[PDB]
Amino acid sequence: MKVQASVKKICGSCKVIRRNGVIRVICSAEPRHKQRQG
Amino acid sequence: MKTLSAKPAEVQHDWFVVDATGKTLGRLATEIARRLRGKHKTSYTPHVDTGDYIIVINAEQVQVTGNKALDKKYYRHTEFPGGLKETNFEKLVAHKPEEIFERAVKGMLPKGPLGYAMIKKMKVYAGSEHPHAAQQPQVLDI
Amino acid sequence: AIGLVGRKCGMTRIFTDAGVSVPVTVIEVDPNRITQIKTLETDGYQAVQVTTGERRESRVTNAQKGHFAKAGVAAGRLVKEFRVTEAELEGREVGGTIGVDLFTVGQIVDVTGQSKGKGFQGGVKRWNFRTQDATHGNSVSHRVLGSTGQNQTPGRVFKGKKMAGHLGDERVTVQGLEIVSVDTERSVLVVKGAIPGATGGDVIVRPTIKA
RNA sequence: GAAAACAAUCCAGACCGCCAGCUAAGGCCCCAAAAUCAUAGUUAAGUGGGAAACGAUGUGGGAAGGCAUAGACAGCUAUAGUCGAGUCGGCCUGCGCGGAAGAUGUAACGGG
RNA sequence: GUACUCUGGGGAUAACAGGCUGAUACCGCCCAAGAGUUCAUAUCGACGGCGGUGUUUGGCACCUCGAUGUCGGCUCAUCUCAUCCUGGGGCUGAAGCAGGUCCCAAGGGUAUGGCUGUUCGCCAUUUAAAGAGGUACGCGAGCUGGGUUUAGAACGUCGUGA
RNA sequence: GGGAAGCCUACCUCAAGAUAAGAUUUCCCUAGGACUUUAUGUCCUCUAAAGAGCCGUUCGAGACUAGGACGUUGAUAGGUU
């Protein structure tokens, strides 16, 4: 997981979601693309 | 002179019973404090206690809005170093609803001997039963 | 849990067949006489009240005389309660006795007593404070407290600061002790290790709650 | 008098007395005088009641575009086939969200 | 010239500590040319940009000069978390054993000696670990007085000399 | 739904001055007159119990206190054996 103020999609397998008011990015292809914050 | 203050010996204290089920805590507490201080009577005197006795039943059913059930926190401090004790409304309403009502009405009553005298007239019980059937309280909704 | 009240009689040793020396304390038990049974209906909690020892008539007040007469047992030198559950109350009635056979060899028990009083003591003995230099220019400060706080912030002494004061003479419980012998004929329990208090003091033996 | 407390801020310039009335700044649920006042909306963050570059299908309101039931988009079958109306990608604009770690004790609405 | 010194005065005006500020210091973020055998973003990251703390060197002279007496050591502490060990997790250029980086977590614990007055620092040998800070750079009406800053004397240097 | 040496319980000690002053067992006191400001009123005469303290011999309790035991129906302390 990458915790960082700026979160963006890296590839076509990335998805932006909101959970309990927190912005996260989940990747089906690359686990290293998982992000949380901002 | 011509403006007369109420005499404590001549004051009459009635008894009322209130159900707290499905009511907002603060908007109930304002009326409770008003009636305890006696502002509703035309013989109101700031230095005399002219209120009435208020019994509160079903105290654990009191409600709060928003996310306050989880977010409203209650604090106290033991005078030992680093002794800060901290709790939540959800747990406090399950444990000691009387503390909930006591804090809510104390915050609104005056801070002094007269306020301490006034707060003693509020009786809070978790269940729907109270031990003051001898006083023949009348039903009051507020 | 249900327990026994006894008197500390002194320390000794027991030798095993292999020759190991086991230190032990002896507890003399005058069998406990039940005085009152408390219940949820009358008292709101479940306890068993017992008395032990003897007291001469001139030292028993009329109220205690009536209390003893209600249960029909002789007055003792003390009265103590044990909190109990529903199962323990079975077989227990006013006027009954608890001797010594309540315990068995090898059972782990807790022993509670009153510790020896050391009077008014200082930091070195009460709190294990360290002394300052005996030489090298130290004037009159060997066993003194030292610094007791910070500067103008906070400007006070924090409550609970360790200082000189009375030490000892308090209730103390020791856990994890083992029953080495249960002498019914002499009505004594021999337990391994040491227990609080001086010879002749009153002690309480209970089944261990950490097991 | 008001801004909790607060010379330099806002209102206002105290000759004395009154248990009379109207107003200024600021206010009207309780501490504490006065609306739990009336009609339209917005916010869900206790935002209100500290805050930056930057980040985001949060939620409203606007002026315009591509495509489309001679069948639009997303799913499924090997550019076609069954589903059966809205669907896409941008520009403004109101209120909200992360960015947000400190030392005695809640301690960033005076409190409830 | 005065450290052999003296009187009248000033926090109208310096040295310590407190206060305002945050250039400096420390920490956290934004962009991503490149380094990573290919791949910016496992680990780093050029040129530039935005913040936080009050932990450094500083700026100002608001309190104290009819006095707020201490560099280090000793004794005794209390708090913060930007976490040293122990506890729970994501990613990995994570086979295992061990690592790297990030998130949560402050309950407890978190060395003895040689040298110097040292705070530090280097060294020897241990430990699971020998954390970073605030509290008048905690603590001297609780102790010491080695450094430093009176009065004696000597060397190097400066001055004709004091 | 799961989920940490972290939070509340859990282990030990204190705790109803908790003025909200709580609960249980047992024990004790069951007499007459006068007056007036008509009241849990004031005075006298008669009675004072259940207990507590003073005092003493003392302690493994202790600065002084407090606390524990005992005081002839006695082993509390000293002596004696």
Ligand SMILES: CN(C)[C@@H]1C(=O)C(C(N)=O)=C(O)[C@@]2(O)C(=O)C3=C(O)c4c(O)c(NC(=O)CN5CCCC5)cc(F)c4C[C@H]3C[C@@H]12
């Ligand atoms: C004394 N009275 C007037 C107030 C009062 O009464 C209360 C109170 N609680 O009572 C108080 O908050 C105050 O006293 C106070 O001190 C405040 C602030 O700090 C402050 C601030 O700092 C910045 N931001 C910056 O200046 C940034 N700089 C400027 C450019 C870049 C650097 C902006 C800002 F609006 C404020 C508000 C004041 C208010 C003030």
Ligand SMILES: CN(C)[C@@H]1C(=O)C(C(N)=O)=C(O)[C@@]2(O)C(=O)C3=C(O)c4c(O)c(NC(=O)CN5CCCC5)cc(F)c4C[C@H]3C[C@@H]12
């Ligand atoms: C409600 N209570 C808590 C206060 C209160 O009672 C009063 C009052 N008058 O009574 C009020 O002033 C307040 O409500 C308030 O609103 C304040 C501010 O503005 C403010 C501020 O802005 C900045 N700094 C900046 O903004 C700019 N920085 C540049 C980089 C990023 C941000 C710094 C700062 F300390 C403050 C103080 C607050 C105080 C607050």
Ligand SMILES: [Mg+2]
């Ligand atoms: Mg003693």
Ligand SMILES: [Mg+2]
């Ligand atoms: Mg000596």
Ligand SMILES: [Mg+2]
């Ligand atoms: Mg001396």
Ligand SMILES: [Mg+2]
């Ligand atoms: Mg000496």
Ligand SMILES: [Mg+2]
């Ligand atoms: Mg202000």
Ligand SMILES: [Mg+2]
């Ligand atoms: Mg304000």
Ligand SMILES: [Mg+2]
């Ligand atoms: Mg004022």
Ligand SMILES: [Mg+2]
């Ligand atoms: Mg005038």
Ligand SMILES: [Mg+2]
């Ligand atoms: Mg008017």
Ligand SMILES: [Mg+2]
């Ligand atoms: Mg009002």
Ligand SMILES: [Mg+2]
């Ligand atoms: Mg706020």
Ligand SMILES: [Mg+2]
């Ligand atoms: Mg502001």
Ligand SMILES: [Mg+2]
């Ligand atoms: Mg002078």
Ligand SMILES: [Mg+2]
């Ligand atoms: Mg000045």
